[PDB]
Every structure is written in C-alpha cells, then in structure tokens.
Swiss-Prot record, chain C:
Domain of life of the source: Viruses
Protein source organism: Bacillus phage SPP1 (Bacteriophage SPP1)
Similarity comment: Belongs to the SPP1-like portal protein family.
Location of this chain's protein in the cell: Virion
Name this protein carries in UniProt: Portal protein
Full-sequence portion shown in this chain: 303 to 353 of 503
Summary of the function given for this chain in its UniProt record: Forms the portal vertex of the capsid. This portal plays critical roles in head assembly, genome packaging, neck/tail attachment, and genome ejection. The portal protein multimerizes as a single ring-shaped homododecamer arranged around a central channel. Binds to the terminase subunits to form the packaging machine. Necessary to ensure correct procapsid size during capsid assembly. Once the capsid is packaged with the DNA, the terminase complex is substituted by the connector proteins gp15.
Extent of the signal sequence: none
Assembly behavior: Homododecamer. Has been seen as 13-mer and 14-mer multimer in experiments, but assembles as homododecamer in vivo. Interacts with the gp7 protein. Interacts with the connector proteins gp15; this interaction occurs at the end of the packaging when the terminase complex is replaced by the connector.
Length: 370, 370, 51
C-alpha cells in the first residue's frame, strides 16, 4: 500500500456528518451557535453584551434513540440451534458483556448512521471483539475484509436526519421565548418634554427616589417587551406531535381520552416504533450473522469444530411491549374454554409466563397430585 | 514514575465538569450567579443595591437522581450461585454496609458521570473497600490496575447533561418573576407640572400626609411594574413536562384523568424510568462484576479457595414498581382457574408474596391439614 | 437605548414600535386540514389516538 494515498483518504475524510447525531444525543444542538447581534457605525455585525443570549437545546434525539435501543436490545438476544456444541460456544461468548456492548452499538448506529466493530484474537489466544468507532473508519471495496458493519439504514444516515429540522425549530422557538422573558425585565422609558436639564439627575432621581419630574404637557411612556408565550406554546405543541411521528417513537404521556387501556389502543400506540424496530432488527441481524461467521472461522482454525451459523443457528429478539395482561388472560381463558385453543398455545401466550417449557410441566405435576 | 509529570497531570486536571452535577444536586445552580446590573456614566456595568436580586435554584436534579438511585439500588442486591462456600463469603461481605455504599455510588455516578472505588486489604488483614471520589482521580492506560470504575453512561457525563438547559430556564423564569413581585412594591411617580418648588416638601408631604399638591393642568401618574405571572406560568408548565421526559423520570402527581389505576396506565408511567434503569443496571453490573473479581483474587491469595465469579455467581436486582395488586391477584386467579397457569408460577407472581419457596410450602401444609 | 433605559423625545412626538405579527392561529388552522388530506391523498393509516 501507499503512504501518500493514506493522507488523501484522511484529509478527504470528514466526521461532521457522523458526529451530527452524537452531538444532538449530548444536547449540543446547532442552537448553541445562536448569538444576539446588532450593527455598528458602518454596518459591522456585532454580538452585544447588553442582552442575555439564551440557547436551549432539547434532548429529543437522546430520548428517541434510547427508546429504540432498549426496545430492540434491552432484553438480551437468545440463540437456538440443534447443534448443541455450537450452541454452547455461542452462549459462552455472547450473553452478558456482549449484551452491554450490543446496546452501545445500536445507540451508536443510531447516532452515527453506522457502527463498525472489529473481531480479533487475544494475546491469550481467545476470541475477542471491540467496537471500532465508525467516525475513525474509512472503507472502499480471514478470507473476507476483517471488520463488521452494523448499518442503521440503507442510507447509513443517523436517525436524526429525518427530524433534525423539527428539533432545531423547537429549540429556536424556546430560546426566542426565553430571550423575551429576559427582556421583559428591562423596561424602556420614553421621556416626552422632560423637565430636567441634567442627565445625571434622571438616573439617580428614579433609582433612589420614586420620582420622575416632567414639565410642559409631556409625560413618561414605558416600552415593555411582549412575550409570545401563547403563540409559541400553540406551535410547539404541533412540532411536538410531529416530532414523535417523524421519529417513529412512542409517547406514553397519559391519555386524556379514556380509551388507551385496550388491546388495539395499545397496539396503535406502538405502531410507529414497531415500524422502526423491524427495519433496525433486519439491519442488526445482517451485521450479527456476519459476526458469527467470523466466530465460526475462529472455531474452524482453533480446532474446536467446523460449523455453519447461517444455516444452523437461529437468533431471537425480545420486545418490551406494554400489554393489557388482564385482557389477554381472559381472551385466553375464553379461547381454551371455547375450545378454539390448546392449553399449550395458551400457556406460551400467557403474559405471566417466562419459560413455557417449565410451566407446561408444572401444571401437569399439579394435576397428577390433585 | 516522574514527579514533574505528576504536576502536569494535576494542573491539567479540572474537576468543574465532574462537580457540575454535585452542585445542582445541592441546589447551587448557575442561577446563583445572577446579579442585577445597570450602567454608570461612561458605560461601566455595575450591580445596583436598589433592587432585590432573587435567584431561586430548583431541586429538580436531586429529585431525579434520588429517584434513579432508589429504583435500582433501594432494595439490596441478591446473589445466587451453586458454589455455596463462595455464596457464603459474598453474603458476609455484601449485604448491609455494602448496600448503603452502593446507594451512595449510584447517586455519585449520576452527579459526577463516573464513580471509582478502591479495594484494599485492612490493617487487620481483612478485605475492605472505600469510595475513591472520581473528581480526585486521574486515569490513563493484583495483576490489573487496582481501582473499580462505575460508569454512569458510556460518555461518563452526569445525568444533568441531558436536562441542565431546562433546569436553568426554569430557574431563570421563576427568579425574574420573583423580581417582578419584588419591584411591584416600589411605586414610581410621574410628576407633571408639579406645584411645589421645594424637593423636600414632596417626599415628606406624601410620606406623612396623604397629599400630593399639583397646579397648572398637570397631575400625578403612577408607574407600576407588571408581573408576568400568567405567561410565566404557561411556559413553566411545558418546561416541567419536558423536564420529566428529558430526564427519564416518573411523575406521580395525581391524575386529573380517571384512568391511572390500570395495569397499562401504570406501566406507561414508569416507561421512561424503566428505560433509564436498564442502562444504569448494565453499567452498574459491569463495575460490580469486576469488584467480585478482586474479591476472588483476595480469596485465592488468602487461602480461602479459588473461584470464578463471572461464571459461578449470579446477581439479582429488585425494582420498587407501583402495581395494581388487586388486578394482578384476579388475573392470576383467573389464569389458574382457566388452567393456563401452574399454582407455582402464580404464587411467585402474587404481589403479596416475598419468598415463593416458603409460601408454596405453607400452602401444601395447609392442604395436608385440610 | 442600549445602555440606558431611555429614549429622549421633544416636541409633541413619541416612539411607536412595530412588531411582527405571528400568524400561528390561521396557520395552525390550515395546517390541520392539509394534514388530514395528506393521509387521504397518500392512502395512509393515522394511528393518532381517537378523541
Ligand atoms: Ca445551552
Ligand atoms: Ca438561591
Ligand atoms: Hg425533517
Ligand atoms: Hg437539554
């Protein structure tokens, strides 16, 4: 390879698109660049120390990403195969530290648009994997190339890409309104046909005595800032609703309407995130299958057996989904009593059951006693 | 090691990022720096003794942190293994003072962004552990390095990071409004075509007698401060709601809407916090596993046996979650009656049961009598 | 004005301020219909909660 092309690849590379989502996840929004300006003598744009420059950046993106991460990977991934030796080795590798890392990957892939992570044999000779921050990686196209991509989309943009317009707007409005609250304090006086000749007399005479002296037919008008709380609040409300839509998220704010408890009502609530979860699963599995291919290669060469993950091993994702356990249990009891259902299927579908194998077995031993 | 490098490390170290969360936890918010200024002759910015400078700083952060702490660690951590000797040694070490310290760690790791704690052998020769304040620690990279990191995030920022903007805004508004209430008391008079020539005559004549004398066609206008209670109240409302979201907290103010009792309605309520708790658990466990690695090293060398915590020992976190116990007991009863459930599983799922083992046995011995 | 609270005026004059009007209401009213049509025109499902 060449050392000169290396420099081109480095100097042509830019991490500003991939860091975008990371900066928003941290409440470093473009609104932090807001500054309150004014114009000099010959129109020189200048910041002015006179006025407070509030710039509020909202944690919307961090909320949505976290929600997505936890939904897909909060519960550890389960694995099933008929090849038990393989099953053992996979479980040994991937069921505790793996979980905590895969969690960091999904958040990362949602902030960066892509997350790479690299497989490598330890100094002790054991198999290991470390996260390889995509904003340090440069890609152009063991046997195959030695890194594992986890793609967020096909487009490999951050989730932020589809709603950054809204977060920015939300921030813009909030801060504007904040400035208005600050400016409301500083009252501006209009002095019509003022009595005193001295300028000193005014500022002292108002500040230390209640009085402002005025002659002629004049007086004192005050100019106070208007605070646009109402209009701001009205718009913000919409932006807020759209935000959830645009981000395919769930809003479990309490339902004003007295319906939200029912099966369909709940299903509808999660509809969009369920949309967003499925893609992300497809994309996560893609990366993970390739990950177990590499682990299979390691096992072939370390002399621990030759395996085919892509055809032998099956993965199971679990979803933390709000249900109406009371409703389900009844539907199930009706179902079985009706005889449109096996107790087997029923027990597995029962919300208070973790492992259908153990419970199906527990119910039989109960009967053989009673 | 070098003593000059030591100085560099120390002088280059800054604790302000890590003490940020500790200061807000103690209601020393940035708003405490607010001061009511004005401008001199030649534009010198100066604090003015004339006006009261309210600066109210809100306990919001402390509330959320306290809530997180308690949710994760409020109930003591439970340990299970098949190796009973190990299990004994672990319990002896970690079930009373360890609870009270781990609580202080979680609180600390949420204010600081990280917390370190150091294992060390006592003067009496016994195993001991002390908290090692992260703001006094400097890290660059027994066998392994001798300190245990408890990470708040991956980014090792405080939780405050994701909602400090809001807290500040909440403080800013409240204080401004307080100033308004303060200023309202001091009435400012506008004196048009004033009758008296003497300046003395006014301040005494108003102060001791009800009278202000005016000639010409003039009069007395008063200028009173406006108090922005309404607009403030409206904005403060939204911020508050956002605050709860941005922080992944639970707000158990009472529900105007008559739904809040049901299973799903309560699940929705804790949705965000359950999110936040799961990350924090992973991160806590990570630190804790390593802590039990060190305990294992001590045990190996102290001649009390060689163990593998990472594979033998299992940990159990408990969560204090609000439930509808009345509803669950029914569903369970229905489930068992229906035949979709073993009494075993049901007993373990019953909200009035602490130890399933004792109660499954108690019910048997009841039957063998009846 | 920028360093003191004051604007000085003589004669029989004064200071009026012009501030932008924000069309939030009409806009919110219009945006509402467009959103409804959007879902129709696009043959989509709106699973917003049912009032
Ligand atoms: Ca800010
Ligand atoms: Ca204070
Ligand atoms: Hg957008
Ligand atoms: Hg924020």
């Amino acid at each position: 390879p060449d050392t000169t092309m290396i420099q081109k690849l480095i100097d042509e590379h830019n991490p500003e698109p991939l860091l975008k989502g990371v900066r928003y996840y941290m409440c470093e929004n473009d609104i932090e660049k807001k500054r309150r300006t004014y114009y000099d003598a010959a129109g020189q744009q200048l910041v002015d120390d006179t006025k407070t420059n509030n710039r509020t950046s909202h944690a919307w993106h961090k909320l949505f990403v976290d929600q997505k991460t936890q939904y897909l990977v909060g519960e550890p991934v389960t694995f099933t195969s008929d090849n038990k030796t393989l099953l053992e080795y996979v479980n040994e590798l991937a069921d505790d530290d793996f979980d905590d890392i895969l969690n960091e990957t999904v958040k990362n892939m949602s902030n960066k648009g892509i997350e790479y992570w690299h497989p490598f044999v330890d100094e002790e000779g054991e198999f290991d994997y470390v996260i390889f921050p995509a904003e340090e990686m440069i890609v152009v196209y063991w046997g195959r190339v030695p890194i594992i991509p986890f793609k967020n989309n096909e487009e490999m943009v951050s989730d932020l890409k589809f709603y950054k317009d809204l977060i920015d707007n939300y921030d813009s409005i909030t801060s504007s309104t904040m400035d208005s609250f600050s400016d409301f304090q500083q009252i501006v006086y209009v002095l019509k046909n003022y009595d005193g000749e001295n300028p000193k007399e005014f500022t002292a005479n108002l500040r230390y005595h209640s009085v402002i002296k005025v002659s002629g037919d004049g007086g004192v008008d005050t100019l106070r800032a208007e605070i646009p709380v109402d209009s701001a609040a009205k718009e913000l409300e919409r932006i807020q609703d759209e935000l959830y839509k645009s981000a395919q998220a769930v809003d479990n704010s309490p339902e004003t309407i007295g319906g939200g408890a029912t099966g369909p009502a709940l299903e509808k609530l999660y509809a969009l995130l369920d949309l967003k979860a499925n893609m992300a699963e497809r994309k996560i599995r893609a990366g993970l299958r390739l990950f177990f291919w590499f682990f299979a290669e390691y096992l072939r060469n370390t002399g621990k057996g030759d395996f085919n993950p892509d055809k032998e091993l099956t993965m199971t994702f679990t979803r933390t989904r709000i249900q109406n356990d009371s409703e389900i249990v009844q539907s199930l009891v009706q179902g079985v009593t009706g005889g449109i259902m096996s107790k087997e299927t029923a027990v597995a579908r029962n919300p208070f059951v973790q492992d259908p194998e153990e419970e199906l077995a527990r119910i039989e031993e109960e009967m053989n006693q009673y």
